[PDB]
């Protein structure tokens, strides 16, 4: 029945709040995980047959796909505590651009405005695990979800760099892209309503 | 010390007045200038403009001697005349909106950022929000405008909201503070940031 793509920037709790609400309406449900850099390329494939996509990546007029804001989540710009960016005030994007960025690569090679690397010096990886291993080791800087960097910010294994830019983290819209068939279904609007209502309350 | 500050017209009055309040507390001698969001960045990048700070919803990333940060958040609404085809039906995507005339803010430069560029291909450019809503009131198209510009007309039934299904409570929008490289070292500016941010969160 319902193929649902979830993106790895969506928090585990955010998934289970999405998971549960679907259980109340649908019986059969497939959950699929991708990088945020591959999420919108995945749904665009016809042969993938994906009904819903919950991701942070953004686009305007998509073929056969509606769009809505499901809620918000936080990302943090991070680096090793002894990395030169820490021992320094960080007022611009062009200050970060002097140093190397560890970004997610896509299978296509291109990125959206939101996910395109902001640096001249760039090193691509395929998941946030790989990204943070490099960053922990002192190689570059990266932007990653709160849940991926939470434990290490308490440990002092990483430092936050984005805190004068946007205190509390970099607020990020979580979109829901959905197949146009799902416009009508009362079960889907219920899903939307109860997903949102609960995602606010986290 | 002395400051010339730009604030765009998408920033609501209580947000403007809060920012005014803190600046006058931390600096002596402040000046204000108001512009369309679509002309805010092009204004501060002029030679003889001498604007030290710009508080605006428009985005650029790089391309300037100005530092960037996020001062706060603000809500916009997609609106239309209560009749008009878009109301007598549901509305899930850009495709539906792109079948009708957008009344967009136009820039004097000619260009637009990714944020402010019109989504439809049937488009009609105005120079401010007053003019946008005059055409929207009259039934000519749809537009996106701040809450405080449409608050009174929405409760009258003069306008209707087309964007509650897409983003309940309004389309959330970051308010950026662009600032002079000279200000980055000054304690008064950092105090200003801390105080304004906390007061803005309290609104
Ligand atoms: O790096 C990028 C492009 S890749 C990207 N990956 C993301 C992951 C997520 N997520 O996991 O939720 C969200 C957004 C992402 N964007 N943008 C970028 C945004 C803000 C910054 O903050 C600054 C800090 C100091 C001074 C100036 C700016 C720096 C860079
Ligand atoms: O039209 C634009 C670009 S121009 C623009 N002017 C702005 C003013 C403000 N402000 O005053 O605060 C803020 C953002 C602006 N962006 N974006 C756009 C955003 C969301 C929409 O919502 C939908 C509604 C129904 C179904 C699908 C989507 C539609 C269009």
Author numbering:
A (entry chain B): 94 to 295
B (entry chain A): 93 to 295
What did the publication describing this PDB structure actually write?
MvfR is a quorum sensing transcriptional regulator that regulates virulence functions critical for acute, persistent, and relapsing infections, making it a high-interest novel drug target for treatment of P. aeruginosa infections. Two of the most abundant HAQs, namely, 4-hydroxy-2-heptylquinoline (HHQ) and 3,4-dihydroxy-2-heptylquinoline (Pseudomonas quinolone signal [PQS]), bind and activate MvfR in vivo, leading to the activation of MvfR-regulated virulence factors that promote infection. The MvfR LBD consists of two subdomains connected by an antiparallel β-sheet hinge region, with a hydrophobic ligand binding pocket between the two subdomains.
The structure of MvfRM64 was determined in the orthorhombic space group C 2 2 21 at 2.65-Å resolution, with two protein monomers in the asymmetric unit. M64 was found to bind to the hydrophobic pocket where 2-nonyl-4-quinolone (NHQ), a congener of the MvfR native ligands PQS and HHQ, also binds. However, a subtle local conformational change was found in the region of helices α2 and α3 (residues 181 to 191) adjacent to the binding pocket of MvfRM64. The Leu183 residue shifts down by 3.4 Å and rotates by 180° to make direct hydrophobic contact with M64. Given a distance of less than 3.5 Å between donor and acceptor atoms, a specific hydrogen bond with a 2.99-Å distance between M64 and an oxygen atom in the side chain of Gln194 was identified with well-defined electron density. In addition, PoseView analysis revealed that the phenoxy group of M64 forms a pi interaction with the side chain of Tyr258.
